[model samples]
Target: DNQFYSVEVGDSTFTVLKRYQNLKPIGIVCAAYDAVLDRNVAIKKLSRPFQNQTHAKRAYRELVLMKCVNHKNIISLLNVFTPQKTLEEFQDVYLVMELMDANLCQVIQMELDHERMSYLLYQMLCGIKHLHSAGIIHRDLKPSNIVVKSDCTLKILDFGLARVTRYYRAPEVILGMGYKENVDIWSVGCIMGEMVRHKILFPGRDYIDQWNKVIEQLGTPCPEFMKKLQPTVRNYVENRPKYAGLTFPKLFPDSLFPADSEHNKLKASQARDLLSKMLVIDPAKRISVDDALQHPYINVWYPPQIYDKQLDEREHTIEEWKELIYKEVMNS
Candidate 1:
């Protein structure tokens, strides 16, 4: 035959490796070597996504939304394929995406400085802002759902599981009140607080305890806020032990803060200021994603990387994150 015959090499093919599955926080997934693209990527074996048609439906929603998202701070969905080989065998969705060096769980252990911390938070805000712009609420925003490269470029994941994350939920959610985008903003606050304090701000065993942990630190809700709660919820909240609460300065003192910046603006006060606005118990008083972006602490880095000289060869930024991961990996 003088004609050529060929099949798509990318058609469900990969030189796969395993036991790499529990890439911390990722439940069950594989990091594969893509011979076709000549790169490394992760293939997630979606758990129970198709179990309920509604679960499957919601899962599909994230997949589609991820495809539509094009932001520096958001993870990219490289491919979606399946590995079911039988009759009536339409199951097991494998998602292929860029594999980063490590996640916040790992990074939280590192002694990152102000510049590093600021940029990381800035990128998170950028990503969150991007999602909000599209009317998406990453209702579950936490360190585990976010990842980073060695140079410190960050990307968010698991938009599929946005409906929950107890420690990160707003009081409104715990109180069974209607919530909107601000709930996600509340999540950002907890994540931000965790990053600064190197621990879960509110470590609660249950709903009541969760509220207790919050008010214990942030003080009990105002009478006006209490008035808005559902009657049953209000009665319970009213009866719960009152917490006069600790001030943000005491909770997040200057000692825990990163070193000062060249501009002297990224001080403990500024950081705490932003955190205060973010961690407000009431959603109405909480800062919007846009407002958070504009805050003095985060707003400092609204740059062309003019600060870094010095940043981004892509690898410039990538290089920074790379070295950090390399060191962490060696020690990890």
Candidate 2:
């Protein structure tokens, strides 16, 4: 029923194309684009439009945050305009932002190769670094949120979750006992890991099950760390009351994260090592984005993309890769 609804303003139009999947009754967004210039815009109108002055104040804050930043990696908010006609649809806030291309997930599914993976990851880290520099946390850093253009250039999209609370949650608003920026870095590590493996790293069977998977692989969170969290977290890790001292070297019982000696065929072990470091249980000691940019694995075959150097080769399709390596071996 939401799709059939729309609001019009001036030569431009505003309509409720569809209700956002996770955020409901919050707002309905209608967008328009400059087809000639390829520049686009979006107008966010509060659903069940609220007249609360406090809600209006926060909306204004969000708009100001979006407009202030000019980083290439961060999605730009070109303009914010309200239509003469108002809808009871949006309750509190309205936001306008530039349109983006496809996200990282679609591109990875299209071709999961090391070269392409490296290029994209390198660029993403640069973007992440930029966001960190600006003191903004993009709590959501999954592949689906990254927008990639025809040239393979990317832009991080969907900053709706950027300004979240300490403990991250679903639907809307990230809340928890205390706030920590490491949350976003942790998310980035998860995204990076999934991109290479071409599968969901942490499916989290359920809330408890989710922590179980993380604990089983990354080890249980420290008791001291647990104390820092709200008491509610105790429910998630009920199976363990204290720090279990889990380590990546012992996580894979079946050698799922194979050792270098076991896998003579390729170099996945090094990748695993890098991931382990990034996703360490202790957020206080977790690798910072700046330090991550300096890690050896990122520069194994080439120089850093953010620095001066010829760019590394892009990822190769599986078939193309097989041919290249096989031909080289035979020729040599």
Candidate 3:
């Protein structure tokens, strides 16, 4: 199958596969052998990088963030380049990264034991915690954005649609209200639930439907949460049928989980407790990343040294970021 598009950069050549991802445009990915580094690398060409300001900004944001965040569980930006020499002619951007075998969605369908499941979940929280510690919110976190190696190693990717999707969006995001880092926790819960059930936790077709699906299982938001909403938004939410919600044990039944073993020590109750905290409809009541790291379900393997310190922050203008990225690509 001749399904790859080829490109040459400096002394290296890349063969990008001809498959289109749902959110990203076509011709975005390729596989290549980096002769300089003597290794295989995945390359991504940002679709229509300079098509418009919106497109350009998205590409830039993804580039800068990927370059800035350095964590084991976060995808590393190996290199970045643009064929165009000048900003005016810079219509395409390419990013090189470490390749992985499959995404979490594929892993979700497999009959994974508890050890793999808990370790994967722990790594996920570690990645999110790293992002949060740096004051970055990964608004979109679903199964597909999470990639895994055959050994159960995981890393998060795709921040371009971080705040775009509805299925994993928090209630505040849906209501157009102010949100905090805990919004990502809601998404983490959704992904974790899917991992357990092998299906979407809240399979909402649209924003309203998404909300309905969430509240259906988690039940209605509390009065404190309602008070934060605008009058019309509050009215609509309050008017919906008030649900009593289900207990975590009932919501995530024992039948849905694999049996515990010496390799995987998380009890069902501990897992449910973590889920209940993560899936809280109200951001105010949701678990913080720090607390989640300390939870009994997660703390056993938690890297205390990393958790003890916060990552430093950086602020960059779009043009400044472009310069930094260009310098990186040129140096590589």
Candidate 4:
């Protein structure tokens, strides 16, 4: 009979249960009080980031990338653990990340003022700009991949390939052309449009189906843009029936926006102009992150108001895995 007690007792499952906050309702994770350290943290059970050689390598990259980065709007990996402690038994892994109040998935559902929404968009771009600064083609971004505190502070989470979600995916990504940092900018454009319409910009049935959906709303691509596709994808795209494309006015009308700020800074035209730039289907033409931060729609934010890393993708592996991870947790 072991009767040790702390309201936030270490999990019967985990060896180091004395971690993070008076842990509360969360998904794939929970908040807990680190009785040993006197602070709160979030625990994420990475069920088996090491199920196979492929799986193990993927998780290793995630671990090292999270370990190296630093930025206000990017989530930090506070610590990590494995219940078994040996490479062979290292299937169950846990991550300690800063506990946040709400993920952007929840935030997207609530009614928000232009002031708060615009501020969130600004921080998203700012954090992304920092990642691009690190030369990280940090490809994945979406509502579910971001978090926000009740105070309106935002932070990005997770790092993916087909990796980017279909609804938020860049055209270049979907078409199988090589992509770049502007890919995230396209995702930002999708998030921005969703914030305005209060719905997903491209409701994906699947990647290919949703590619058509994007074309329907945004209109077809220019011939030269279409020409960039590889022969296999190009032939299908060209035959899909051309669309002259939808205008910014019709796609994002004045009626769809919240009122502009008193300073008249975040107007509908300004907002659509930004979306136009950020969402360009052609990756070459998409707005760069810095230009987005400088644009009229979001330029309104200086962030005394709002609060907000690049991980190298160089391949890192397992044994190789457990020893490095063992040392990793020790360093924490």
lDDT of 2 by residue, 103-159 (tens): 677775663455566566667777777765655556656665577766777777544
Candidate with best lDDT: 4
Candidate 2 vs candidate 3: which has greater lDDT? 3
Off by over 4 Å in 1: 1-26, 85-87, 160-165, 258-266, 303-332
Clashing pairs in 3: 16-30, 140-162
**Which candidate's TM-score is highest?**
4
Cα lDDT of model 1 by residue, 142-205, tens digit = 7777899899999998663333338887888778777777777888788778877888899889
lDDT of 3 by residue, 1-332 (tens): 26445455434444343331221221356556665576667777764554544554555566656766788998897766656567544445677787787888899898745567778878988888788775567677878778888998999986524332477777888898877877888888887777778888888887788888888888887787798889999899988898887878888898786665643335766788889999998888899878887888777785212321211134445565555445545554
Model 3 residue 47 CA deviation (Å) reads 2.1
Candidates sorted by TM-score, descending order?
Answer: 4, 3, 1, 2
lDDT of 4 by residue, 1-332 (tens): 13222233244243344434355536357777776667667777666555555666556556765766678987798777655545555556678877778877777777645677789999998888876665556566889879898899999876554233488878887787888788889998998888877889899787688888888888888888987889999999999876766888788777776555644444666777888898788788788988888887788786111111212333445456555555555555
Predicted structure 2, TM vs. truth: 0.62
Q: What would the TM-scores of all predictions be?
A: 0.79, 0.62, 0.80, 0.85
CA lDDT for candidate 3: 0.71
lDDT (C-alpha, whole model) for all candidates: 0.68, 0.51, 0.71, 0.72
Clash tally for model 3: 2
Q: Candidate 1: deviation at residue 190, Å? A: 0.9
